[PDB]
Design a protein around this ligand. Sequence first.
Ligand SMILES: NC(=O)c1cc2ccccc2[nH]1
Length: 330
Amino acid sequence: STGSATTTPIDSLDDAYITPVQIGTPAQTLNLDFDTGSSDLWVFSSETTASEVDGQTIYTPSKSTTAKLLSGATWSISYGDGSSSSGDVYTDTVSVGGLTVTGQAVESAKKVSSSFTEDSTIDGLLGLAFSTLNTVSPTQQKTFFDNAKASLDSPVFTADLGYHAPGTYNFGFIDTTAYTGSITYTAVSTKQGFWEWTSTGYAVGSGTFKSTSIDGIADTGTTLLYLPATVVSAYWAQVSGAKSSSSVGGYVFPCSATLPSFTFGVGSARIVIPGDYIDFGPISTGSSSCFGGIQSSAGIGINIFGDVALKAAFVVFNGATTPTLGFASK
Ligand SMILES: NC(=O)c1cc2ccccc2[nH]1
C-alpha cells in the first residue's frame, strides 16, 4: 500500500504545516501537525477541557463505531517549546492520504497548554519519530508509520514541505518526479528516539564550505533551524545590523535586509536554503526588526534541522531495519 497527502502552511510565515487525517467511522477529518520530532498521535477531542478549545475541530470517539477505549492508558507530553498536553487513549481507524491503519492509538487530550488553544488551525499532532519516545503509559504505543510499515510497498515516508506553498507527505514510495538530481543517504542514530544524523558542514552565502560535523535531528515539528552558536554567529555576521537580542529571544535583523543563503552538507552533497526562507518577519506587528530563521541551539542541548532546512529539500525517512535519511534538492 501507499498514501499521499497534501500538507499546507498554517500561516504566511510557514510556522507549521497541517495535513488532513481521517479518524474513526464514519470518518472525522482533523488537520494534524506531522512531527518527525515526537511519537504521539494526539487530538483535540470531546474530552478536552472546554475553556481550552478555541476553534479547533475535535474528535468525538462516541460517534465512531470503531473507537475503543484503551483501558487504563494515559499520556502526557511536554515539547521543546514549553507547550504540553495530556489525556487518555482510544484505538481507532486512522487514514492518511488513502493509507489506512486499524487499531491506531489515538491519544485524546483532556488538557492542552495555552499555545495549542491559541492556534485554531492545528487539531493535534501526528508523531513520526521512533516509537520508543511514545508517552502512553503503562503500555507504550506505536506511531502511525510503525503500524503501517509492514503493509507499505517500501518502508519509507517522505517530507516535501513547501515555501509559502503546499507540499506533500508520501508513505510507502519515493516520487521520483518530486526532486532534482539524486538522493544522498546518510546514517541515522536512533539512540535518542529521533531521526538523528550528522551534517558534514556549512557555507554562508557564496562563502567557502566549512567541513565540520554537526549532529542534529530532522524535525518537521520545529519551525526554525537551530545550530551551534559558532555557526549561527558566522551566518548573522554577514547581515548588516543583525544582532542577538535577549529581550526578543534570538537573532533579529533589519526587515530591509536581503538575507544570504545557507548551505548544509549531506555527505558530499549540498542543500541550499535560499535567504528568503530565513526571514520570519516582524517581531511584532509593524516593527522594522525581523526575526531570524537560523538560531542558536546552545540552550537546547541538540541541533535541530527544522522546517527552514527541511523545506529546501525532498527528505526521505527510511524506516528499513537500519534506518537512514535521504536528502535531495528540488
Ligand atoms: N515525556 C515527555 O514529556 C516527552 C517525550 C517527548 C518526545 C519527543 C519530544 C518531546 C517529548 N516530551
